[PDB]
Design an enzyme around this catalytic site. Structure first.
Site, PDB file in Angstrom:
ATOM      1  N   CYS B 162     -15.946  33.323  83.482  1.00 44.28           N
ATOM      2  CA  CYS B 162     -15.422  32.116  82.872  1.00 44.28           C
ATOM      3  C   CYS B 162     -14.080  32.168  82.175  1.00 44.28           C
ATOM      4  O   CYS B 162     -13.549  31.072  81.909  1.00 44.28           O
ATOM      5  CB  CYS B 162     -16.389  31.509  81.848  1.00 44.28           C
ATOM      6  SG  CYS B 162     -18.030  31.241  82.529  1.00 44.28           S
ATOM      7  N   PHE B 213     -24.271  25.580  84.303  1.00 48.37           N
ATOM      8  CA  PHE B 213     -23.263  25.737  85.365  1.00 48.37           C
ATOM      9  C   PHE B 213     -23.181  24.614  86.372  1.00 48.37           C
ATOM     10  O   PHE B 213     -24.188  24.183  86.942  1.00 48.37           O
ATOM     11  CB  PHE B 213     -23.546  27.090  86.063  1.00 48.37           C
ATOM     12  CG  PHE B 213     -23.411  28.317  85.192  1.00 48.37           C
ATOM     13  CD1 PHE B 213     -22.730  28.239  84.008  1.00 48.37           C
ATOM     14  CD2 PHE B 213     -24.001  29.532  85.535  1.00 48.37           C
ATOM     15  CE1 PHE B 213     -22.589  29.311  83.169  1.00 48.37           C
ATOM     16  CE2 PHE B 213     -23.864  30.648  84.685  1.00 48.37           C
ATOM     17  CZ  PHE B 213     -23.154  30.517  83.502  1.00 48.37           C
ATOM     18  N   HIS B 301     -12.618  26.816  76.760  1.00 51.07           N
ATOM     19  CA  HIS B 301     -13.640  26.864  77.791  1.00 51.07           C
ATOM     20  C   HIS B 301     -14.962  26.482  77.142  1.00 51.07           C
ATOM     21  O   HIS B 301     -15.433  27.232  76.276  1.00 51.07           O
ATOM     22  CB  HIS B 301     -13.762  28.310  78.328  1.00 51.07           C
ATOM     23  CG  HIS B 301     -14.864  28.325  79.368  1.00 51.07           C
ATOM     24  ND1 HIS B 301     -14.790  27.585  80.508  1.00 51.07           N
ATOM     25  CD2 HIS B 301     -16.042  28.996  79.385  1.00 51.07           C
ATOM     26  CE1 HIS B 301     -15.907  27.778  81.224  1.00 51.07           C
ATOM     27  NE2 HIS B 301     -16.697  28.598  80.550  1.00 51.07           N
ATOM     28  N   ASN B 334     -20.273  23.334  82.853  1.00 51.54           N
ATOM     29  CA  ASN B 334     -19.441  24.531  82.814  1.00 51.54           C
ATOM     30  C   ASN B 334     -19.099  24.966  84.245  1.00 51.54           C
ATOM     31  O   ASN B 334     -19.990  25.477  84.933  1.00 51.54           O
ATOM     32  CB  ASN B 334     -20.241  25.623  82.094  1.00 51.54           C
ATOM     33  CG  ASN B 334     -19.624  27.007  82.073  1.00 51.54           C
ATOM     34  OD1 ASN B 334     -18.610  27.267  82.712  1.00 51.54           O
ATOM     35  ND2 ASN B 334     -20.277  27.917  81.340  1.00 51.54           N
TER      36      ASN B 334
HETATM   37  O1  LIG Z   1     -19.843  26.975  89.918  1.00 53.36           O
HETATM   38  C1  LIG Z   1     -19.986  28.055  89.103  1.00 53.36           C
HETATM   39  C2  LIG Z   1     -20.055  27.760  87.694  1.00 53.36           C
HETATM   40  C3  LIG Z   1     -20.328  28.867  86.832  1.00 53.36           C
HETATM   41  C4  LIG Z   1     -20.589  30.159  87.331  1.00 53.36           C
HETATM   42  C5  LIG Z   1     -20.865  31.217  86.401  1.00 53.36           C
HETATM   43  C6  LIG Z   1     -21.199  32.511  86.836  1.00 53.36           C
HETATM   44  C7  LIG Z   1     -21.272  33.596  85.886  1.00 53.36           C
HETATM   45  C8  LIG Z   1     -22.252  34.593  86.112  1.00 53.36           C
HETATM   46  C9  LIG Z   1     -22.396  35.617  85.152  1.00 53.36           C
HETATM   47  O2  LIG Z   1     -23.136  36.713  85.379  1.00 53.36           O
HETATM   48  C10 LIG Z   1     -21.498  35.759  84.059  1.00 53.36           C
HETATM   49  C11 LIG Z   1     -20.795  34.579  83.677  1.00 53.36           C
HETATM   50  O3  LIG Z   1     -19.956  34.757  82.612  1.00 53.36           O
HETATM   51  C12 LIG Z   1     -20.450  33.660  84.727  1.00 53.36           C
HETATM   52  C13 LIG Z   1     -20.453  30.443  88.725  1.00 53.36           C
HETATM   53  C14 LIG Z   1     -20.269  29.342  89.631  1.00 53.36           C
END
Ligand SMILES: Oc1ccc(/C=C/c2cc(O)cc(O)c2)cc1
Ligand SMILES: Oc1ccc(/C=C/c2cc(O)cc(O)c2)cc1
Lengths: 387, 387
Positions: B162, B213, B301, B334
């Protein structure tokens, strides 16, 4: 107000390589007897025709030995890794998320010792690998392992492939040149645990990777405005390019799957490279007024010997131009991104050893090429250093 | 000779954002009813206590809807993706090696149309994703899909997490500023096919990712020395930093495994971010003589609402500072690296819409933060543009 900030923030001279260190897994694997070992450990002794093809591939590889993290014991404990296509990514990842940064640390320590300045002066860190991915990445691991400052500015380059020794140099050039005082640690570290797999007679392209890929890491310190007689320039970067050869779609592919990282060759890579290398050379050297390619020093990713042979043939390079490249291919095999940085180390060390006038075999200008998926060619124009 | 080349090769003013375009998968997924859908599609209706926890997580998420490539039909055809931990990477990869560049193309076309200049003038391409990897990468795919020149200089940033909306800006700044005429297309594109998984009551941290997410892509054009009244500055980059918060080892981890990309939260991320944000702000703004953090415009973020709430609490930000951030979290969730670039788009569009004096909510200086694995904080100091 921002104009004044910009002016004060930037560096002034060319990005320069100030130190190079390398490292390889301790296990030395002889090529002469590799066919026999590899067909036995993969339980493939009954594939007699395929074995004879592999023996021919190894005998023509021009590789005498490679260093591999993978051992007979490890392979015995991971039969899925020994099959051509079995679920094995988790096991492979567990190996390389540790070994990539461990090996990168070894090379980096060597480069930092050569540089001779406090590690607290490293402002930027580029880490590059084609083996394994993780979060936080190998850049975070190397920051912890080396004790770099927590505010080092990191660049994690994953799954890039063989042209990325060129890419890390193209990247380091801009970081160093646009940031006054910046000192960039660059680490390429490649481990074949992710690519090793057993042989299959309908996948001969895959088999070529098993004859050629080897393990290793190389580290650099890159910076502009070297501090006179504290820091010691080895090579200067002047200009860079990256391009995609025409008519090369799908020449080299590689997917990271449940069975690990695959490798496919669907087109004639030596022929594509050879047909497009002149164009890359006149883009780079026509603005400098140079057209004699034996008058510059050479570093070329030795994807396999045929790339080198066909380049040398196409251009009429003297056989000695590729000596430094061939010596690395001979002693370490194709280490993907790290390869070209081992070749820079070999050339400057041999030039110094033999009392030549410059680090570039006595010549002023030189070229470094990376070749890999796309089909991608990376070009870096270098200037040597006196003594 | 190299001094003259260096001097002629570099740009002169600050890296500037010249265009922003975004895109999301067409499938709009309402948050109010997501708990019900997600527990049904994952065959988890019997986990009644876990369901009530997830409903609470979604009701507190401050997300009204997200856009997802994944649909009920796709999920029915991939039961392994619906389990908490089943072999499914190959299926997920097949989805995202296509959808990442497809979605990135949509956003990129929008940014290029806004910029209004020939795509042949794009010299550099940065592509960033946390979902899936492949060789040649999504940068090669986007070069082919958009018809960029084959010699575009590519930067493929994979598996970053992120904070990488901040990282692509830190990278683009140096490419644009050190290269006269350079025009950088920047694309972050994130698709949750790789992270979606079923619920498990001994893995509540994982479950948080399922509430937060979302999918989306954002594209920028970045360049120094904008051509007056041909090109139109939106924001200028002035200074950047990346750091690792102390005492945050293993706060956020993510491994790319045979079962896809996992997500773990082992420490209090809102608390770590909040405890370390002041330090990041005085590094950035003390040299500019600014200490009132309500006097700058904010982009943060939105990893989850608690990060925003605790930052606002720690610093005493007026509730309105985070309005642009919260509006993106509300309408898209997110989206990992892309999030912050959607927030820049929202802020400049709303500032223009409401007739404010600058693109930064009427203020001159601003800050953008990315937060992610490490625990990593990326800082980008921005200057707005008049009108
Ligand atoms: O569309 C998307 C939106 C968010 C993400 C996040 C993935 C991710 C996975 C983790 O292990 C650690 C994290 O910090 C981030 C991936 C795809
Ligand atoms: O130690 C290492 C040495 C070489 C390699 C090469 C991997 C690789 C895999 C492909 O699909 C495409 C290719 O261009 C490169 C990886 C590890």
């Amino acid at each position: 107000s921002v104009s004044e900030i910009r002016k004060a923030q930037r560096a002034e001279g060319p990005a320069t390589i100030l130190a190079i260190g390398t490292a390889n897994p301790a296990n030395c694997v002889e090529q002469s007897t590799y066919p026999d070992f590899y067909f036995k450990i993969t339980n493939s002794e009954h594939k007699t025709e395929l074995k004879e093809k592999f023996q021919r591939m190894c005998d023509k590889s021009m590789i005498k030995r490679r260093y591999m993290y993978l051992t007979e014991e490890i392979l015995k404990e991971n039969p899925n890794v020994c099959e051509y296509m079995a679920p094995s990514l988790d096991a492979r990842q567990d190996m390389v998320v540790v070994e990539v940064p461990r090996l990168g640390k070894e090379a980096a320590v060597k480069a930092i010792k050569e540089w001779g300045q406090p590690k607290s002066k490293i402002t930027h860190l580029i880490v590059c690998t084609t083996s394994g991915v993780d979060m936080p990445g190998a850049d975070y691991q190397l920051t912890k392992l080396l004790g770099l400052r927590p505010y080092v500015k990191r660049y994690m380059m994953y799954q890039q492939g063989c042209f990325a020794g060129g890419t890390v140099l193209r990247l380091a050039k801009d970081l160093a040149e646009n940031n006054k005082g910046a000192r960039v640690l660059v680490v390429c570290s490649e481990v074949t645990a992710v690519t090793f797999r057993g042989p299959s007679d309908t996948h001969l392209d895959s088999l070529v990777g098993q004859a050629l890929f080897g393990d290793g890491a190389a580290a650099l310190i890159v910076g502009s405005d070297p501090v006179p007689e504290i820091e010691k320039p080895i090579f200067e970067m002047v200009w860079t390019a990256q391009t995609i050869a025409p008519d090369s779609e799908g020449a080299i592919d590689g997917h990271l799957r449940e069975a690990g990282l695959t490798f496919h060759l669907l087109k004639d890579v030596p022929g594509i490279v050879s047909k497009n290398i002149t164009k890359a050379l006149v883009e780079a050297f026509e603005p400098l007024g140079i057209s004699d390619y034996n008058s510059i020093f050479w570093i070329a990713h030795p994807g396999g010997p045929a790339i080198l042979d066909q380049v040398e043939q196409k251009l009429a390079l003297k056989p000695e131009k590729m000596n430094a490249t061939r010596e690395v291919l001979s002693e370490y095999g194709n280490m993907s991104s790290a390869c070209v940085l081992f070749i820079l180390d070999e050339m400057r060390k041999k030039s110094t050893q033999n009392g030549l006038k410059t680090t570039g075999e006595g010549l002023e200008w030189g070229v470094l090429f990376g070749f890999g998926p796309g089909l991608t060619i990376e070009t870096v124009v270098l200037r040597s250093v006196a003594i």
